[PDB]
Amino acid sequence: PPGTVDKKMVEKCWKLMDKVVRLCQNPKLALKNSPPYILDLLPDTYQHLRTILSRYEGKMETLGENEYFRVFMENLMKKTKQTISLFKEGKERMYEENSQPRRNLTKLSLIFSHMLAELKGIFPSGLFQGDTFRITKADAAEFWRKAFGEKTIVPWKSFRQALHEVHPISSGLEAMALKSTIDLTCNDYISVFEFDIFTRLFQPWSSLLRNWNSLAVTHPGYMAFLTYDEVKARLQKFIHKPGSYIFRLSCTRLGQWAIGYVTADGNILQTIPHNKPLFQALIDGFREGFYLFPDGRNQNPDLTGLCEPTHIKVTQEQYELFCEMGSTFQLCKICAENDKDVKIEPCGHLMCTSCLTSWQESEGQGCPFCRCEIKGTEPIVVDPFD
Ligand SMILES: [Ca+2]
Ligand SMILES: [Zn+2]
Ligand SMILES: [Zn+2]
């Protein structure tokens, strides 16, 4: 895997994508129009795929041999069947908002959003431009070329080992946490589009992982992907506390941050740092007295050490908590399909049985997360009532 793409497969994905549309059109659901919107993202993906097939009408063989497209269509079918099955098992819970199956539909919608953004970035106007994809940051670009050359997409394991040579990765828990941020399409593959977005968010390249640890992993202000209405909702509690701020990612504008803050008048405003790294904007904003309380907390981090040449560490408890951020606690964070049903001793990490088995059968060393020895295992129930 992944195998070549036949026209019979593309017709199969379309039959699947349509089934998801029919399910989400249900008035009993009453989805949110705010991005990501799956009822718009799917027909756009379909309409763009036709554009791709339109340009490769006379040259279909070369399209099926394209490594990126084989991966994309593989993930498209997997993420679509995952959504269809989500409606199947969830049953009545889908209708009640803020339910665990319903929340997973939001996570999947965000991934479908990331997929279309990647497809339009790699196939502009329906033509493959992957090998000539320009990585914005220079220092990040020369790294990719040295390690992967003209490759559009690479396996996570290959990407992890490569990045490890320049920016050290102390443990597998840091690796899994790193993957949760950079692997937008969630297909165990890293593309130039994904790599570009990440290296733009956590610039400079010289202190890449040292920036990501201090801005996302251990920073209360980090909110990942949120809607502006969701930013107003959380900051509304601290509307009587000028200086209260949070920063988020936007699915409609990848690669840049959006900082929400509380004024003295009692308003919630929102700015976008443009040409300076996030920590440089937070430091300056801290001196100005606008960015004072991350998530309303009186303990604001000192990021001034990032400008200096060199030097902080992160607990493994913080890495594990970061992995549980972008989704619900129910989901296994390895496959992001099945729910947890087994606990590993003595590290206490949770997962599903299929992943643990797949890791052991693949001659893996110990726990899939921390790679520590497995003394014993015990089963857990994640959905006790339903
Ligand atoms: Ca990916
Ligand atoms: Zn799993
Ligand atoms: Zn473990």
Residue numbers in the entry: 47 to 356, 360 to 435
Text from the published report:
Casitas B-lineage lymphoma (Cbl or c-Cbl) is a RING ubiquitin ligase that negatively regulates protein tyrosine kinase (PTK) signalling.
Tyr371 is on the LH, and, in the unphosphorylated state, Tyr371 and several other residues from the LH, including Tyr368, bind to the TKBD, limiting movement between the RING and TKBD to rotation about LL2. In the native state, Trp258, Ala262, Val263, and Met274 form a hydrophobic pocket around the aromatic ring of Tyr371 and the side chain of Ser227 forms a hydrogen bond with the hydroxyl group of Tyr371. When Tyr371 is mutated to Phe, the hydrophobic interactions are not disturbed and the native state is maintained: the UbcH5B–Ub binding affinity, Rg, Dmax and Rflex values are comparable to native Cbl. In addition, previous in vitro autoubiquitination assays show native Cbl and Cbl Y371F have comparable catalytic efficiencies. Thus, in solution, it appears as though Cbl Y371F mimics the behaviour of native Cbl.
